[PDB]
Design a protein around this ligand. Structure first.
Ligand code: HEM
Ligand SMILES: CNc1cccc(C(=O)O)c1
Ligand SMILES: [Cl-]
Length: 393
């Protein structure tokens, strides 16, 4: 009943151009079986959304990568939030909600915006830049480690550690094997910065530890929740901002609309998250036999959700392959959906908005002027190098 496909969604060929194979996955049926990895797949918006919003049946505590924690040891202690189900998920999630809360964004917005403006001014002095290293990476590195409260020394470990984490959700291919091989120094640095004395007053890390006397988390839970922010909160924004700049470079008509109304900055970033979907995929594990889109899936089965494909599904979106900064983007799954929906989405949107605002006010044109190089990761989609010429307004 279920179609079986040989597509490997973690192969370099797939990463290089995933869109034809994603249509093949959507059009084969609402539920597919991927023979390469012995998992079920859902690539249409409807089934991805249904799976995300039934965490009882499609759980996260057996891992959101290919590995089933019931069968194999996790490569690092499980995340207390990403790799937990309700009710154990609920109180740590509430603490991160409050640490990254609507009210908290007010304390950081002025500094994030000034750093975004300063970066664009600096880049305009050079003219020809790499929008990945010099913008998408440089800007979050200039604000997020400080907002965490990290010391200066050792920050070079942060992007390698996060790349490792996201590669580790994948199957045991060479990308994953090599990441884990190189992991020991980055793991050591990150685990050490998660301890209370190493997190500067007023930053996100200190605020997590401060919640350990409310009864929502205990002191021994705080370091792993800091670990969540250091795993999840930097590389994702790098690829989100990189996606937005790549979109503006490829769709100059949309840059022109953004210049004419810079208040579109927040939605231009949200549309870039839909359009590129920096986090491409996550798994769930079934806790019972279940009917999904007509198919019967047994207990204990891994289900691969194609978030990027769901965000391009023509059953849900008009002209899904167009970048449209006034699109009604509500309901895209680039941040997930439901109880695990990205707890840092307000930080991500703040960074994206203020960077696109700086570009909207200061730049007249963004022209690719060198070879574009893709970066390969089992979970993240983004570029390694994006040479652009920035023309000043
Ligand atoms: C463009 C940037 C980002 C994207 C595309 C993104 C994507 C996602 C997605 C798809 C999920 C859901 C995972 C699932 O359902 O299993 C998620 C959850 C999460 N995100 Fe983000 N994220 C971004 C930025 C951030 C930032 C800036 C932070 C922290 C400062 C962060 C921290 C987290 C955490 C801790 C979770 C787990 C939440 C839970 O399990 O309840 N993320 N993110
Ligand atoms: C998607 N969000 C995410 C990614 C990687 C790690 C974690 C974590 O909680 O460690 C969360
Ligand atoms: Cl680790």
């Amino acid at each position: 009943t279920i179609p079986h496909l040989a597509i490997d969604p973690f192969s370099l060929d797939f990463f290089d151009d995933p869109y034809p194979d994603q249509q093949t996955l959507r059009d084969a049926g609402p539920v597919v079986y991927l023979d390469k990895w012995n998992v079920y797949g859902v690539a249409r918006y409807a089934e991805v959304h249904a799976v995300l919003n039934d965490p009882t049946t499609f759980c996260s505590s057996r891992g959101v990568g290919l590995s089933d924690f019931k069968k194999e040891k996790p490569w690092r202690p499980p995340s207390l939030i990403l790799e937990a189900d309700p009710p154990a998920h609920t109180r740590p999630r509430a603490v991160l909600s409050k640490v990254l809360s609507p009210a908290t964004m007010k304390t950081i917005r002025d500094g994030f915006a000034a750093a975004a403006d300063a970066k664009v001014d600096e880049l305009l002095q050079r003219g020809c830049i790499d929008a990945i290293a010099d913008l998408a990476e440089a800007y979050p590195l200039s604000v997020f480690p400080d907002a965490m409260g990290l010391k200066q020394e050792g920050r070079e470990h942060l992007l390698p550690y996060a790349g490792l984490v996201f590669n580790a959700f994948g199957p045991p291919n060479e990308l994953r094997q090599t990441a884990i091989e190189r992991s020991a120094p980055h793991q050591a640095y990150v685990n050490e910065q998660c301890q209370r004395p190493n997190l500067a007053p007023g930053g996100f890390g200190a605020c997590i530890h401060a919640f350990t006397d409310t009864g929502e988390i205990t002191p021994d839970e705080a370091p792993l929740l800091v670990r969540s922010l250091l795993s999840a909160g930097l590389d994702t924004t790098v690829n989100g901002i990189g996606a937005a700049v790549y979109c503006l470079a490829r769709f100059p008509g949309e840059l022109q609309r953004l210049r004419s109304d810079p208040t579109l900055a927040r939605n231009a970033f949200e549309e870039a998250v839909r359009f590129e979907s920096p986090v491409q995929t996550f798994f769930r594990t079934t806790t019972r036999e279940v009917e999904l889109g007509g198919a019967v899936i047994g207990e204990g089965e891994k289900v691969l959700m194609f978030l990027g494909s769901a965000n391009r599904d023509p059953r849900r979106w008009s002209d899904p392959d167009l970048y449209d900064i006034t699109r009604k983007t509500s309901g895209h799954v680039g941040f997930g959906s439901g109880v695990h929906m990205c707890v840092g989405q307000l930080v991500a949107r703040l960074e994206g908005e203020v960077m696109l605002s700086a570009l909207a006010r200061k730049v007249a044109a963004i022209d690719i002027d060198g070879p574009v190089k893709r970066r390969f990761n089992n979970t993240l989609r983004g570029l390694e190098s994006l040479p652009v010429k920035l023309t000043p307004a």
